[PDB]
């Protein structure tokens, strides 16, 4: 059980993307079973450019892409976008005080897909905006490693991989 | 070989839809090798709202989605439906008596799925009917654990991750 | 290591097709190594009726899909056909007297495809021929299975599983 | 963890291709965790005719396809072509001496995919280039592997399989 750090990582010229699952939670039953209490889902981290071959990590913004959004995306049609509007605090005290809104529209010559994450703070009228072009070929890979991905974060692996082991059982 | 509950949920303002695989079944030969004996398939329950965030699952109606069935939902084109009749005590004296129906149209505006499940008892003059929207990133998210899963209902995954340690002995 | 069998069927009023994994084949080297020295394919095996909810298994014709022939299949238009010609001596001396024909056909309505194996016995004047037809639903599930089953066949799932274990080692 | 050698394999008149997968590379973190630090590939192997039933192995040009470039591949339109450029020696002394080019092309008549992998050493006046024709089905055969194996290539099916037991624990 050791831990993978394994970030998918798209670097271009005024800024970087890296996109890393996370597991779903369970819970121990009585009997023993485990239940899913939380999908899966993918954490996306934007970072600015801030020098040569470098970008400035300490003024990331992250944005958690739901099982749901993420069927949004492998969905696209090639002139369609999609935008999602999450409060991160959303319960909390702080609630409505912060937007992030993530953006994905395609590239006005069919080259590709934009992304844009706006992280709003409108009670102090800051606006934090990552903008990254993502090519054909770099969103090709995204829908395939996502569509890979998406029957982990439901938990569907724990229920493929356990046919070959409870059938003997 | 500990039991997993990993139902996919879709809640919605009058109804919610939850989805969970069943693996395919065995038989053991004298031999020691295992034969199928039964494909897997998907348990579809429908419950109507009945509160905020509550869904009267007392009065749930399921559907059980055979590997055929889930093949034709994978391969709708953009204005077509299906319709899947069940007649859940064939055989059973209580042949002909009710009737199951599940129908997955498009959405008049191309924004998705509409699914219904009808449960339909003559002799006693009922019908009850659950429907609910699906949205084309929802049924995206469908689409891609279905394929992920059909290769394990037909017991081919069995076959699969067989090859690597087979293959030494 | 148990044997598993999982072919799959598709049974119809004058005909039924069962379709069966078979896994790849390989040499142990001195370095402890393997190497592998046949691609695995599919076992297709096709009865005629025989009698109410019966198929004559005793005459049943086989045919081997490879590799590239299931690539055909997945890549096959709506209105594209593929025939395939196998003769099952080549090299032995019986080679040229026995062919092997799968023919598969796109459905005249849009509803399916046409499975036709046809083994011929020039020298002693007979033709067997079995014909199946498959809904657009049970072709999709095909598709599935076969896309799913190809890494398996060519080996490299037995990459795929071995980068968790050797990573570690 | 032994090792296993599968490379996919296409045998024509002129040329032949392998296709051999490598897998990421990882560090270990003193916390135990690991680390991706270079993500996996796939080795394409070209050699030219050289004789009945074989190929000049001795002869062969190689081509290293990254993540990325896969995911042109499993993006092209049917009449769209990719053409990607290599030098072996980026960073060392010989820089800028040796290019690599692969192109891919479509064949005129809709039929399939041509390769051209070109070696050109200016200095030497010499370019070494091998072309292969590649059939639809064949192509299909390598897109639905690349799918396969472009999650684990990025180390996202160590996460995936990692799911099932640090649930547990």
């Given at each position: 059980?050791?831990?993978?750090?394994?970030?998918?990582?798209?670097?271009?010229?005024?800024?970087?993307?890296?996109?890393?699952?996370?597991?779903?939670?369970?819970?121990?039953?009585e009997s023993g079973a485990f239940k899913l209490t939380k999908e899966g889902?993918?954490?996306?981290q934007f970072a600015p450019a801030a020098g040569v071959?470098?970008?400035?990590?300490?003024?990331?913004?992250?944005?958690?892409?739901?099982?749901?959004?993420?069927?949004?995306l492998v969905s696209l049609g090639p002139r369609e976008s999609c935008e999602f509007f999450h409060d991160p605090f959303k319960g909390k005290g702080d609630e409505g005080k912060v937007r992030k809104v993530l953006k994905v529209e395609p590239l006005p010559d069919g080259s590709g897909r934009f992304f844009n994450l706006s992280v709003?703070?409108?009670?102090?009228?800051?606006?934090?905006?990552?903008?990254?072009?993502?090519?054909?070929?770099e969103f090709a890979v995204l829908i395939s490693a996502f569509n890979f991905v998406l029957p982990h974060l439901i938990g569907?692996?724990?229920?493929?991989?356990?046919?070959?082991?409870?059938?003997?059982?």
């Open positions: 059980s050791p831990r993978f750090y394994v970030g998918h990582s798209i670097y271009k010229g005024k800024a970087a993307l890296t996109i890393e699952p996370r597991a779903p939670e369970f819970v121990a039953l889902f993918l954490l996306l071959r470098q970008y400035d990590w300490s003024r990331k913004q992250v944005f958690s892409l739901s099982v749901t959004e993420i069927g949004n709003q703070n409108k009670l102090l009228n800051v606006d934090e905006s990552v903008y990254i072009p993502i090519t054909k070929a569907w692996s724990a229920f493929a991989n356990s046919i070959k082991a409870a059938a003997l059982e």
